[PDB]
Amino acid sequence: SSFKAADLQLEMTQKPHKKPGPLVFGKTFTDHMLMVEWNDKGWGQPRIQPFQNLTLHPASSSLHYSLQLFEGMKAFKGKDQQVRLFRPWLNMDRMLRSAMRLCLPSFDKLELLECIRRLIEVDKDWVPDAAGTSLYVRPVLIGNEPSLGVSQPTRALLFVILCPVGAYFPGGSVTPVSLLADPAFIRAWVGGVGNYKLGGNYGPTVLVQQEALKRGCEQVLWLYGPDHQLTEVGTMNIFVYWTHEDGVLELVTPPLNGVILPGVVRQSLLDMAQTWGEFRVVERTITMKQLLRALEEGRVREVFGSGTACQVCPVHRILYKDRNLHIPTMENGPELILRFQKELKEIQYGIRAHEWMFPV
Amino acid sequence: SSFKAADLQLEMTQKPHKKPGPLVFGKTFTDHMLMVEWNDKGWGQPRIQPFQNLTLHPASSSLHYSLQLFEGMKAFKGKDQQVRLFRPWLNMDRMLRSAMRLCLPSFDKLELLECIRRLIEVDKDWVPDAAGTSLYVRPVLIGNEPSLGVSQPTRALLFVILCPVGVTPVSLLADPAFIRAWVGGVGNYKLGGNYGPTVLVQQEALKRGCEQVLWLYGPDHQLTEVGTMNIFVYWTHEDGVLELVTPPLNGVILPGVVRQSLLDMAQTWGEFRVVERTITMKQLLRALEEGRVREVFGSGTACQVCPVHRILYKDRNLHIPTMENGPELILRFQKELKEIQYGIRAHEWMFPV
Numbered sequence: 001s002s003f004k005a006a007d008l009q010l011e012m013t014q015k016p017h018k019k020p021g022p023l024v025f026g027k028t029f030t031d032h033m034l035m036v037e038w039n040d041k042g043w044g045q046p047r048i049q050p051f052q053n054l055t056l057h058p059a060s061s062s063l064h065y066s067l068q069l070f071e072g073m074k075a076f077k078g079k080d081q082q083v084r085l086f087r088p089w090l091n092m093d094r095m096l097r098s099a100m101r102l103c104l105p106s107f108d109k110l111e112l113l114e115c116i117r118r119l120i121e122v123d124k125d126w127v128p129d130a131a132g133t134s135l136y137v138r139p140v141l142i143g144n145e146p147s148l149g150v151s152q153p154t155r156a157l158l159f160v161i162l163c164p165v166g167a168y169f170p171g172g173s174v175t176p177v178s179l180l181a182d183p184a185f186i187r188a189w190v191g192g193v194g195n196y197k198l199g200g201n202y203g204p205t206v207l208v209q210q211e212a213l214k215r216g217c218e219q220v221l222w223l224y225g226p227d228h229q230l231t232e233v234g235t236m237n238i239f240v241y242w243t244h245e246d247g248v249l250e251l252v253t254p255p256l257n258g259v260i261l262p263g264v265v266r267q268s269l270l271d272m273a274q275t276w277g278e279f280r281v282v283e284r285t286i287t288m289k290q291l292l293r294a295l296e297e298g299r300v301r302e303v304f305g306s307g308t309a310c311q312v313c314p315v316h317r318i319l320y321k322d323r324n325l326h327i328p329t330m331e332n333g334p335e336l337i338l339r340f341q342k343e344l345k346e347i348q349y350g351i352r353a354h355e356w357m358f359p360v
Numbered sequence: 361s362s363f364k365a366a367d368l369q370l371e372m373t374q375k376p377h378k379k380p381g382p383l384v385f386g387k388t389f390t391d392h393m394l395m396v397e398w399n400d401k402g403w404g405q406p407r408i409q410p411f412q413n414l415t416l417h418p419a420s421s422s423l424h425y426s427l428q429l430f431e432g433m434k435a436f437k438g439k440d441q442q443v444r445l446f447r448p449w450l451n452m453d454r455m456l457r458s459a460m461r462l463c464l465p466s467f468d469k470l471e472l473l474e475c476i477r478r479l480i481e482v483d484k485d486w487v488p489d490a491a492g493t494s495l496y497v498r499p500v501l502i503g504n505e506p507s508l509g510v511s512q513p514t515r516a517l518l519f520v521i522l523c524p525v526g527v528t529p530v531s532l533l534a535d536p537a538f539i540r541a542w543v544g545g546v547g548n549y550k551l552g553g554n555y556g557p558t559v560l561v562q563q564e565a566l567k568r569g570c571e572q573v574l575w576l577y578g579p580d581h582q583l584t585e586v587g588t589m590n591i592f593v594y595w596t597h598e599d600g601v602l603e604l605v606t607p608p609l610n611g612v613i614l615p616g617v618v619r620q621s622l623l624d625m626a627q628t629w630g631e632f633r634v635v636e637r638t639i640t641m642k643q644l645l646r647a648l649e650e651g652r653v654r655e656v657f658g659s660g661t662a663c664q665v666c667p668v669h670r671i672l673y674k675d676r677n678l679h680i681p682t683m684e685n686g687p688e689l690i691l692r693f694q695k696e697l698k699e700i701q702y703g704i705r706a707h708e709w710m711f712p713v
């Protein structure tokens with residue numbers, strides 16, 4: 001039986017910290033945090049407490065066997081100062097799937113969402129309202145068994161921290177990135193856990209990113225299979241806007257076959273494009289073979305990443321088999337990207353009412 | 361650069377805990393621990409201090425992006441109370457490889473080994489001397505960047521804790537649905553991220569009435585590892601040659617110290633062929649049918665060697681005749697390792713504390 005929002009204990013900070021005035025992503029945090037403990041007596045009472053360190057037993061399974069998962073979603077403040085979360089129910093669904101996959105304790109998705117609402121409500125003055133700004137919300141659930149046996153934990157901690165974030169692009173002007181496409185590096189496997197947002201999926205990628213930077217590329221294009229399927233780009237889902245081999249203009253993204261993290265932005269872009277009804281929208285495997293041919297015949301319009309922190313990011317270059325492939329995204333507007341960006345902005349900041357937004 | 365054992369800060373406990381008066385693995389800890397911090401100024405001085413909680417920033421990258429690795433090795437007390445570590449140099453080598461894979465700070469392997477030596481010396485009375493008992497040594501290195509960016513940490517924490525620790529065969533679930541590791545992955549490194557996802561799979565093994573997981577890989581159903589242990593098969597191979605085989609280090613196998621030691625020991629005897637080669641379920645099935653399998657077992661620090669008596673491969677329940685065959689090889693390995701570990705026979709593999 002879940003923790004309940006009705007049982008929320010509150011403790012306000014003695015000295016509130018000074019809000020920012022050049023804000024680096026995920027390094028500046030708000031005054032408060034959510035915390036819930038779980039043990040053999042079930043879930044304790046959720047609490048909003050001042051931001052503070054975690055105290056953990058040195059054998060905590062969070063630190064030895066990676067019993068850890070997280071989420072990431074944004075809250076946006078409109079002109080009327082109303083704060084809204086973007087499609088948070090989907091992050092809750094995803095968090096619960098991750099928790100089950102790691103044998104961590106189940107919780108009630110709406111009870112968590114309400115606790116998170118109360119938390120953002122407490123720190124509402126931390127949500128900025130300038131162009132391209134938002135509050136990043138980082139829920140985390142960790143095992144906390146003081147035992148070196150690889151086992152299902154009998155203790156766990158669930159916490160939530162918040163970070164104001166600035167505009168990823170200057171004045172809403174998307175800047176494109178180069179990608180390294182080397183099949184030696186494999187992010188995730190069918191049957192694995194690449195489709196869950198587990199800490200374990202990220203640490204091994206840090207050296208890969210370093211190797212991309214050494215080869216003059218900004219991010220990693222994650223390839224999979226003997227046919228070099230394009231799966232994800234960095235920590236973002238990948239989209240291609242092109243005329244397909246059958247002559248039909250389409251937006252394509254790889255399907256959810258196990259090696260793809262099902263992004264909330266990804267699903268939202270698919271939803272928006274289907275709603276327009278102006279071109280084919282499909283989830284299909286994308287191979288480097290298909291991409292190279294389409295690039296020779298001039299059929300590729302736009303390539304981009306999607307994800308909460310950066311929203312939509314264009315791609316202009318891919319290094320594959322030591323050969324640079326120019327991707328004509330910025331030449332094609334990038335009008336699909338600019339259109340998505342505009343419609344999402346209107347929804348996120350309340351310019352258009354939308355059921356996707358959850359009011360705080 | 362590296363922290364130096366010569367700079368060791370020492371804080372003896374004021375509240376020593378009563379030692380155990382049966383020990384469940386990895387749940388009882390000794391009075392002290394090693395702790396060393398790293399940042400933009402480099403490594404601080406190492407410190408032996410009383411066992412105590414860690415204090416971590418809520419955004420610590422150890423907890424969000426699994427910038428974490430660990431080791432496991434054993435110290436053994438002989439009759440004359442001399443304590444010795446088993447091939448600790450190899451764990452230092454492996455830990456450093458793990459650190460490099462996760463963009464965590466390098467350190468001097470001999471400096472850490474001396475710090476561990478000093479720690480175990482402080483807690484020497486915790487090293488039990490009963491037959492089959494030992495002290496388990498758990499070094500850990502974690503990233504500790506207070507930042508939600510997926511990036512190389514600018515801070516890290518290295519610590520070491522100790523557990524005193526106290527042949528019945530096991531059954532295995534062999535289902536190709538379950539994948540421990542993949543070629544191009546990090547299953548060949550001792551990183552925390554490799555273990556969390558196995559907990560649900562082990563629960564499935566228990567639900568199907570098995571005790572551990574036989575990790576299968578590839579279209580030919582290769583036997584890779586068993587639970588948290590490397591796998592060995594002792595058989596007469598299809599070419600009629602008596603052989604000890606274990607899977608090769610081709611990316612999906614954690615290079616065990618016990619595993620290497622068993623290969624070293626058997627190769628040195630020169631009595632039978634000792635190879636690193638993949639082992640497939642098809643080969644195992646045929647070998648069992650023809651009565652060529654002698655012994656199957658896992659190897660690893662915590663349990664040393666564990667015989668296997670049954671494998672459930674989908675719906676086919678396979679008897680493995682390990683115990684009916686002595687298990688002669690298992691017993692010989694256990695006997696010769698015991699002689700070395702407890703100082704009965706002086707050996708270069710042992711590092712005195």
Ligand SMILES: CCCCc1cc(=O)n2nc(NCc3ccc(Cl)cc3F)c(C#N)c2[nH]1
Pocket residue numbers: 072177219233234235236304305306307308309310311313314315508509510511
């Ligand atoms: C899963 C991690 C959640 C928070 C987070 C951390 C982080 O470092 N990044 N980096 C991102 N974007 C970099 C990037 C830029 C262009 C392209 Cl094509 C691909 C990329 F990965 C994001 C995001 N979104 C993010 N999120």
Ligand SMILES: CCCCc1cc(=O)n2nc(NCc3ccc(Cl)cc3F)c(C#N)c2[nH]1
Pocket residue numbers: 148149150151432530572586587588589657658659660661662663664666667668
């Ligand atoms: C990588 C984890 C290091 C510490 C540790 C934890 C743990 O749970 N185990 N379990 C072990 N043995 C169980 C077992 C029994 C028989 C067989 Cl065939 C396979 C098995 F995994 C070990 C060890 N060694 C261990 N170590």
Ligand SMILES: *Cc1c(COP(=O)(O)O)cnc(C)c1O
Pocket residue numbers: 072197232234235236237261262263264265266306307308309
């Ligand atoms: C978080 C994440 C995404 C994008 O998810 P959103 O829910 O859109 O923020 C894509 N790929 C990977 C690997 C991720 O971790």
Ligand SMILES: *Cc1c(COP(=O)(O)O)cnc(C)c1O
Pocket residue numbers: 432550585587588589590614615616617618619659660661662
């Ligand atoms: C630690 C470990 C082993 C065994 O290693 P030893 O060095 O012999 O203790 C085997 N397999 C896996 C997956 C491991 O983590």
Ligand SMILES: [Cl-]
Pocket residue numbers: 195256258260262
């Ligand atoms: Cl999915």
Ligand SMILES: [Cl-]
Pocket residue numbers: 548609610611613615
């Ligand atoms: Cl290796």
